[PDB]
Each structure stands twice: as structure tokens, then as C-alpha cells.
Design a protein around this ligand. Structure first.
Ligand code: ERZ
Length: 344
């Protein structure tokens, strides 16, 4: 006989297939470990999910499961296996089995200086992954260094699709200071002004912020609270032009911007004196105030900075485009979506 494996006073019950566990880290509702896969004879990553108590955990779990099982791309993390009980009644936790990566960009940026060739390659793979996501009419909505995994040879995979949504550009408008879910430092200016984050331009902003942080090892706009985030953006971009204010029809939002003193643009090359001039030209185009003028993913890939990698024939798209449900229907939905990994 035998008993289930334990990590730090936690059931991490993945055996007999997955053994020899090491703690990696965690989040709000999951411990993450590596484990030796006895079938494929490789170490893998396993994330323990326990979402059946909160309906926002269930929504987020299901959304990501569905997206990652549909998606297939070298720059997007997949799901290799899902472990759960054979019945709904006995199902308490779900384990998601994924390729084991060495680290993430957040950890790498706190410890390592990136050469220009590393920055270039990382940015290429982010955008290549993002082209596929956007081609499926999906928005990631939470791109940040900790959601970018790296292997030992610096190949990059996008993870964490829990906040992802289908794009909805005609329902993007909202009022001033609308509360938002995604990570503050990577939030586009429009979120704080008049946007629900339903357009592809929201992810490009986040990629711009990540590019800036790769250049200096420091987040470019570290806001300490909701409206501070906009202070930081305007601090570097300067005051919006008359033309860009004219696109902001909502009066509360517009008049807030008109109330502020004039701020000068901080030149990119002053902020980043050792950066490649082409990297700073692309940065400028991704961190454009006005989301309609902001560069799109496919244009970013065609930018001179990425000419060593750019190859649209090797940058694939999705074959096709990709609520009020209680906890019990969401549990049934999660059970159903994970059925393909069961023995029999
Ligand atoms: C899904 C997933 C999550 N994490 C990893 N690896 C990782 C990240 N940080 N560290 C220290 C390690 C070992 N691999 C895959």
C-alpha cells in the first residue's frame, strides 16, 4: 500500500504517475511544485487548484482550462495532464500538469541584467505568442513579467489566462475611475479614464511596460494606487495632446486631464541611455497614450528592431476565433472540461 504525498503540510496528491515532488511557489488559491513524470520520464510542473468555494475562482479556473486546451503554440504554455477525482462528489482539488520551466521573467529581472540580444528575443517571442492569442479574438489582459515563463535556453511561454476575455471593442466604453481587476503597473492609461479593457490595445500597452522593464530591471510606472498609476504614465509621456483628449468624450475623464498642470515628455533615450535606438522607437509605439494610435501586434513584429526574427510564415494564427453561473454549474463545467485526461 501507500499514502498521498505532502509538501509543506498540504496534500499534493498527484501519484502514482508523478513522484519526487519539490515545492516551487504558490499563489492565492494554489501551491505549485515540480514532480517526476513516471510515464514521460521528465520532471514537470504541477499547480494545485482548489476553486470550488468562490465562484470567481471557478470562473477563472474554467476560463483558463478552456483557453489553454484550445490553444496550441510554442510561446503559450499548454496543459499536458489534469488530475482530479473520478466523480464530482469526490472532486475537491484539480491538478494542472504543464511543461517545467526554469524560471519566469519577474525572477529573472530581479537577479539578472539582460543583454540587448536577450531583450530582443524575449520581446519577439512575447509578440509571436500574442499574435496567436489576438488572432483567436482573445485578450490576455494580465501580461506582466511573472506570467512569462523561461526555460534554460531562454525560450518563452505565456501563462495565466485567468483574466482573459473575448475581445469586444464596441462595448469598451465606461466612465471615469471604473474599478479594474488586472495588475496595476501594466494597466493602460485608458483603463483609469474610459475603458473596460475589451480591446487588443490593452495587451500591447502591457507588452510596452514589459519592454521598458527589460531595459532597466525596474517597472516603468510603479503606481501605488488606482489614480497614481495614471500620474506615473503622464509623468513620462507628458500631457495628452488636444487630439488625444478629443477622443475622450466622457467629461469626468477629460476634465480631470485638463485640470492637471502641463507635463513634458521625458525622452526615452534619457530614461534608457544604454538601449538600442530601434528598441526605443518600438517602445514609443507600444506606449502611445491614444489606444487607436497604438501599434498592433502584427505591426510590432514587422518593426525594424525585430528584423532578425521576423518571419510571418513562422508566426502562426489560431484556426478559428475563441457569466451568471453558480458554483455548482461551474464545478460541473470544470469536471466536464477535464474528462479527456481521465483513465477511461
Ligand atoms: C507552469 C510552470 C510554473 N513554474 C515553472 N517553473 C518555475 C518558475 N519559477 N521557478 C523557480 C520554477 C522552477 N514551470 C512551469
Amino acid at each position: 500500500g501507500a499514502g498521498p504525498e505532502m509538501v509543506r503540510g498540504q496534500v499534493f496528491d498527484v501519484g502514482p504517475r508523478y513522484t519526487n515532488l519539490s515545492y516551487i511557489g504558490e499563489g492565492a488559491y494554489g501551491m505549485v511544485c515540480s514532480a517526476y513524470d513516471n510515464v514521460n520520464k521528465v520532471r514537470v510542473a504541477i499547480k494545485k487548484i482548489s476553486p470550488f468555494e468562490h465562484q470567481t475562482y471557478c470562473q477563472r479556473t474554467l476560463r483558463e482550462i478552456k483557453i489553454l486546451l484550445r490553444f496550441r503554440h510554442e510561446n503559450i504554455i499548454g496543459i499536458n495532464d489534469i488530475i482530479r477525482a473520478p466523480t464530482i462528489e469526490q472532486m475537491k482539488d484539480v491538478y494542472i500538469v504543464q511543461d517545467l520551466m526554469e524560471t519566469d521573467l519577474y525572477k529573472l529581472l530581479k537577479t539578472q541584467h539582460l543583454s540587448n540580444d536577450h531583450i530582443c528575443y524575449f520581446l519577439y517571442q512575447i509578440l509571436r505568442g500574442l499574435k496567436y492569442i489576438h488572432s483567436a479574438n482573445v485578450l490576455h489582459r494580465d501580461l506582466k513579467p511573472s506570467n512569462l515563463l523561461l526555460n534554460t535556453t531562454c525560450d518563452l511561454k505565456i501563462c495565466d489566462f485567468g483574466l482573459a476575455r473575448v475581445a469586444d471593442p464596441d462595448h469598451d466604453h465606461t466612465g471615469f475611475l471604473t474599478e479594474y481587476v488586472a495588475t496595476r503597473w501594466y494597466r493602460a492609461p485608458e483603463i483609469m479614464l474610459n475603458s473596460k479593457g475589451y480591446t487588443k490595445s490593452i495587451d500591447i500597452w502591457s507588452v510596452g511596460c514589459i519592454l521598458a522593464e527589460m531595459l532597466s530591471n525596474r517597472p516603468i510606472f510603479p503606481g501605488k494606487h488606482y489614480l497614481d498609476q495614471l500620474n506615473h504614465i503622464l509623468g513620462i509621456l507628458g500631457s495628452p495632446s488636444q487630439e488625444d483628449l478629443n477622443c475622450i468624450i466622457n467629461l469626468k475623464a477629460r476634465n480631470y486631464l485638463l485640470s492637471l498642470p502641463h507635463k513634458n515628455k521625458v525622452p526615452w533615450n534619457r530614461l534608457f541611455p544604454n538601449a538600442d535606438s530601434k528598441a526605443l522607437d518600438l517602445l514609443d509605439k507600444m506606449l502611445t497614450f491614444n489606444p487607436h494610435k497604438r501599434i498592433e501586434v502584427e505591426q510590432a513584429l514587422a518593426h525594424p528592431y525585430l528584423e532578425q526574427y521576423y518571419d510571418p510564415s513562422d508566426e502562426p494564427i489560431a484556426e478559428a476565433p475563441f457569466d451568471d453561473l453558480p458554483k455548482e454549474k461551474l464545478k460541473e463545467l470544470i469536471f466536464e472540461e477535464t474528462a479527456r485526461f481521465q483513465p477511461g
